[PDB]
Amino acid sequence: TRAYWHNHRSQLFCLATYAGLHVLLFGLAASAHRDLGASVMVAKGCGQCLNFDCSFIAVLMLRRCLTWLRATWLAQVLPLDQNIQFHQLMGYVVVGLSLVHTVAHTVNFVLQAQGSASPTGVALLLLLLLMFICSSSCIRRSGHFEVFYWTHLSYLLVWLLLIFHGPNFWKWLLVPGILFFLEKAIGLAVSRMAAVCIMEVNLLPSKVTHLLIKRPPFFHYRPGDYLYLNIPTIARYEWHPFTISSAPEQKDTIWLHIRSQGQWTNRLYESFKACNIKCYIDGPYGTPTRRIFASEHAVLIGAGIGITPFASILQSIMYRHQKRKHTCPSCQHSWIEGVQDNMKLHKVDFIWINRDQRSFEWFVSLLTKLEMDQAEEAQYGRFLELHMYMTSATQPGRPDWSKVFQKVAAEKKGKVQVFFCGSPALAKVLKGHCEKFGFRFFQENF
Amino acid sequence: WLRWVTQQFKTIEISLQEFKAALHSFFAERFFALFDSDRSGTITLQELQEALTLLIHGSPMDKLKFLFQVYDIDDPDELRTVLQSCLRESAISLPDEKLDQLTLALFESADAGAITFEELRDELQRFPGVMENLTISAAHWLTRAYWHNHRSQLFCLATYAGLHVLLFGLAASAHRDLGASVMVAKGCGQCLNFDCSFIAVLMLRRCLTWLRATWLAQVLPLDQNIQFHQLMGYVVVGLSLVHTVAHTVNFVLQAQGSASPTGVALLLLLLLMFICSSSCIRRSGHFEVFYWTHLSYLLVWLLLIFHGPNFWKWLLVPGILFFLEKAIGLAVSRMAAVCIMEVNLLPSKVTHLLIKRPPFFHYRPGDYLYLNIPTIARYEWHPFTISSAPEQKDTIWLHIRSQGQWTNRLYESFKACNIKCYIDGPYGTPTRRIFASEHAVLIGAGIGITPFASILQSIMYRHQKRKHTCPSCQHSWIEGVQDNMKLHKVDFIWINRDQRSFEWFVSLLTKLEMDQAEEAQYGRFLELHMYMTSALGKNDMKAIGLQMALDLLANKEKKDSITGLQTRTQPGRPDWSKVFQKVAAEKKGKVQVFFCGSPALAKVLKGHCEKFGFRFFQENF
Ligand SMILES: Cc1cc2nc3c(=O)[nH]c(=O)nc-3n(C[C@H](O)[C@H](O)[C@H](O)COP(=O)(O)OP(=O)(O)OC[C@H]3O[C@@H](n4cnc5c(N)ncnc54)[C@H](O)[C@@H]3O)c2cc1C
Ligand SMILES: Cc1cc2nc3c(=O)[nH]c(=O)nc-3n(C[C@H](O)[C@H](O)[C@H](O)COP(=O)(O)OP(=O)(O)OC[C@H]3O[C@@H](n4cnc5c(N)ncnc54)[C@H](O)[C@@H]3O)c2cc1C
Ligand SMILES: NC(=O)C1=CN([C@@H]2O[C@H](COP(=O)(O)OP(=O)(O)OC[C@H]3O[C@@H](n4cnc5c(N)ncnc54)[C@H](OP(=O)(O)O)[C@@H]3O)[C@@H](O)[C@H]2O)C=CC1
Ligand SMILES: NC(=O)C1=CN([C@@H]2O[C@H](COP(=O)(O)OP(=O)(O)OC[C@H]3O[C@@H](n4cnc5c(N)ncnc54)[C@H](OP(=O)(O)O)[C@@H]3O)[C@@H](O)[C@H]2O)C=CC1
Ligand code: HEB
Ligand code: HEB
Ligand code: HEB
Ligand code: HEB
Ligand SMILES: CCCCCCCCCCCC
Ligand SMILES: [Zn+2]
């Protein structure tokens, strides 16, 4: 659709520039070997393309530097949450190109039939087929992940073999390769790790587990800071990110809501379907959101399914709001302090738009809780308003942004803002509606 | 002891001149007069022996009689003169009315018309232990030291010299066949390829900050990068000189195209930079002229590309790193066209900027910033520590001390507002570990105590923002914790030679302490200790007499006259045993020490913390 193109705009640009660079290198090597007949030309071309891919696959799968890029607007412009299913694509392309390359050189060696390169080539083809065989989803689907890791560790020996197999290859391999080695060196046992222990585990409906891990003493995170969880019982060497779904004012534990959407998280749900186990979290990462707490009548709008950090944001807002309701220990006169200047809000909206509540029952329960929490406080003033839409049947059907925005602009609470977390098809609509009413728009990357 | 006395006497007849020279002042004159018992002006061996026996081996009554004889210049006028001489020796800069009131109080509390010697002893009896502890400061008579601090800089200098002798030998061995000329020429060629390449990667004003926060700042020096860079420049000039003379001797031996033209060009360019980048160009010149002339590093690198055939191999990494960082820094990268709200000139040539806090400017307590002023130096960017707590929402302070050519020129110019300045936002190590503790002991030794001002002001702001008062009953009560500061007490121990440029810090701590001293009746939350070690120690008889009036003035006013502080200022170095014992005596939580100073005290404090079980820290700033 038109909005499919608008959302996938930043994906199609990257895919097309990749295909363009491939055809550029292919044609460059084609021209430089036009003299040879139809077999070493395509072979040299595919060789150049393989150099490029077999080099940059690693930097495509760079873990630590990718997080640092996710914080800036760079995450806004190009999609850097897709690195895994761009990595699998570049792997498939390496396999296809290496296969056609072997076919080209074997046809050439047959035509010439009418060392260091060829044996190393056979071994390289065998290893690439090993990785492409023991790295497909059928290997992690069944509950063996360490087999996958051990087989797919052979990229090291593939790089070794390829160093003294392609003449100009080490030039390509060096910079991404040295970046990869640097990042694997920075990441050591307990560099930013912590051997925290699960204090409890719940199993909410819709196959979502609700980890209550034990808070590490010196672990301080802003609301919305995701962590990279690791559970040896499930998979020893996998590190899947997860968004902390508990307001930082939680001093005892750290929640994590882990929705079943794959092979690791499914393994987690099924395993605990049978608590104190080992976990190794890796720090708080994510965008700092002080623009919300330093605002008035913020309008948090979360669409799609990237709204787990809004649970943390809303719980932190309501905690810091309850933390300004004083009562005299003698007169019992309860008076409400004005702004604390660490949170400057006078109202909040929350418009969660989705297609259903398939996986988010914990979210709906938490929002009813935070709405009933101040429901008796609504006698003088309502702080948190909840607008939840479903668009498939709670006000069913898509909203009317003119209507809800005019309802916002109806009463005067201050400088109305917007914060958004969703599909860029809707982000520009919100930017247009937003500067129409003088609402200072913002957009969040999570 | 007779041998030491004879040696000391032989070391100087010993007239009053050599006496004052060995003793290192009107007190010195009185001592020279009272030492020669025969009033002969020269100190014989017998007179010096008797003086030493009466001072060291003499009883406290003998020392008291000697002090009384030295004090009676013939009363209040003599006491005032002696106290003035002592303060001149003690660097105690007090007002004339302050000294008058001190002399009056001393004459009131000591004279029971004239200070009687019996009355003098009866009053000195109030001084506990000072009787036996009475000892003249002149008797004080009876390198790896700075390497202990330089154990990290000398590491860098040594590895640098090693990585030069390595390249020199590597190039000399490969070309030993050439006779005595091209060997050193090619050695210097390689050393130049290294220095002219890395001298700029030393100047990373952006990546160093990221490295300044890490423990790499603890292991190797990251503040003295400018001096290491100047040193590498000096050795580039020296090496270029020997390299040109090597090639010219080679040429004249052979005579007995890129080489010669680009050689002359690089030689002249490096000489131009070495001339227009000395101290004199900025002491009495335009910082802009310095910047423009010494911008020629681009031209030097360029002409070096097609002069050293394999030089670009070196220049690849540092050149691209330098240009990457320079491109990251753009006109609105993180700059902010901040407007000075107002400036002051606090004493000791320190200027005090109040720059208007940008609306979207959030800094932790103790974050520095790279201030620039297009009026002082158009292009230089100097770092400075925010000396205003974050909870202060109106303006950002900056306490800038004249310690060079930029800051000094700033002070001079303002000595003659709404100007433009381009700060570079917050930096620095995180400081939340100071707030998440109990009875933290912030110790600031040396000249790194500007962020402790910010931290103390933020701590007191939060403390005052956890004191409540009901609008109805007016019942005032306190809270337990605010979840952003869990402290229960703070001890600020501040060692320095003198109050030279920190009287603003003094006037700030006075404010903090007295702002809650009237609440210390039920609980004291911040304890201020201030040590000016250069002041005369409480063991010196003159210093004993001076304290014998300072203490009375304190009891009269309840304010230590030196600073108006509620606490008293303790001259001399601290006995960390007693300090940590007093810390451990009371129980306010898990003690945590913090520190910012020279490693010489870092090791002492780490040893004592292991002795007393306190989790010593040392923040990097
Ligand atoms: C910052 C962030 C926070 C997230 N928080 C949550 C959360 O709280 N709850 C939740 O249910 N999901 C969350 N996800 C998405 C995802 O479900 C988990 O991150 C995790 O990747 C699931 O692993 P999986 O076994 O299902 O992956 P697979 O089933 O093996 O892979 C299928 C999908 O998972 C993605 N994926 C696989 N490995 C990774 C990886 N290492 N990093 C990122 N994506 C990966 C693939 O791109 C694809 O979309 C988050 C993603 C990100 C980027
Ligand atoms: C994080 C930090 C915070 C500081 N805060 C203060 C403060 O609040 N008040 C204060 O009086 N001083 C402070 N200084 C020290 C110093 O006075 C200033 O940093 C300032 O840069 C000195 O300028 P100058 O022109 O006098 O130096 P110059 O006269 O130009 O140089 C002489 C000395 O200054 C150093 N220096 C010169 N240029 C720089 C530069 N760009 N960056 C760092 N050092 C340089 C040299 O290494 C040498 O030690 C701080 C230093 C650092 C590293
Ligand atoms: N960098 C990128 O390229 C990014 C891409 N994405 C894209 O996000 C998509 C997520 O799938 P999905 O979440 O289904 O798509 P959406 O993100 O469009 O669904 C989000 C919600 O917005 C609602 N919505 C869309 N337009 C309007 C409107 N005009 N008025 C009111 N409500 C509206 C939809 O309702 P209904 O479902 O009823 O239409 C849906 O429930 C992925 O396909 C991915 O490609 C995500 C992030 C960034
Ligand atoms: N990593 C490094 O190499 C660093 C080095 N420095 C050092 O900072 C120094 C600055 O001069 P300065 O700050 O005077 O050097 P110091 O830090 O040694 O002097 C600072 C204060 O510490 C006091 N002091 C020193 N040793 C003791 C002790 N054993 N017991 C009690 N008090 C003590 C001094 O008292 P008194 O003056 O009375 O002796 C002085 O008041 C430079 O010489 C430099 O070497 C600075 C930063 C880091
Ligand atoms: C270069 C070479 C190479 C190649 C060819 C490849 C190829 C591939 N691949 Fe690879 N990978 C790689 C190299 C590679 N690769 C690396 C290096 C990585 C990273 C890992 C780590 O870090 O450990 C990866 C990673 C990876 C991953 C991740 C895991 C997680 O989750 O953690 C995946 C899934 C993949 C898949 C794949 C596929 C499917 C393919 C096709 C065959 N991979
Ligand atoms: C990785 C993937 C891969 C694979 C599998 C392969 C496989 C192969 N191969 Fe190769 N190659 C390659 C990649 C490859 N490859 C490269 C990259 C190169 C380089 C390119 C250029 O040219 O640059 C080559 C190159 C090459 C050559 C050329 C030589 C040189 O060194 O120069 C030849 C002959 C070949 C053959 C071959 C064969 C026969 C095979 C199978 C057995 N290869
Ligand atoms: C060519 C190369 C080079 C050389 C040889 C040099 C050499 C030198 N240098 Fe230099 N620098 C440089 C390159 C250089 N350089 C750079 C690149 C820089 C940085 C700048 C910027 O960043 O802008 C500097 C920077 C610099 C500075 C800084 C400024 C401020 O304060 O901020 C100074 C002072 C200097 C000095 C010097 C000296 C004294 C010498 C000796 C002559 N230095
Ligand atoms: C800047 C500093 C510098 C300077 C000034 C110079 C200056 C000079 N120089 Fe010199 N070089 C150099 C640095 C230099 N340089 C280098 C670095 C090189 C290279 C070395 C290698 O091996 O790398 C050379 C090189 C050179 C050579 C060899 C060959 C080529 O490379 O082409 C020669 C012959 C020369 C000469 C010379 C002369 C004659 C002069 C003066 C005029 N050198
Ligand atoms: C099939 C989807 C392709 C998406 C391409 C994403 C590119 C991510 C680049 C990440 C660089 C670190
Ligand atoms: Zn009351």
Author numbering:
A (entry chain C): 182 to 295, 319 to 478, 515 to 633, 667 to 719
B (entry chain A): 9 to 20, 26 to 37, 41 to 90, 96 to 133, 137 to 166, 182 to 295, 319 to 478, 515 to 719
From the paper:
NADPH oxidase 5 (NOX5) catalyzes the production of superoxide free radicals and regulates physiological processes from sperm motility to cardiac rhythm. NOX5 catalyzes the electron transfer from cytosolic NADPH to extracellular oxygen to produce superoxide (O2-) in the presence of intracellular Ca2+ ions. Like DUOX1-2, Ca2+ activates NOX5 by binding to its regulatory EF-hand domain (EFD). Each protomer contains a catalytic core with TMD, FBD and NBD and a regulatory EFD.
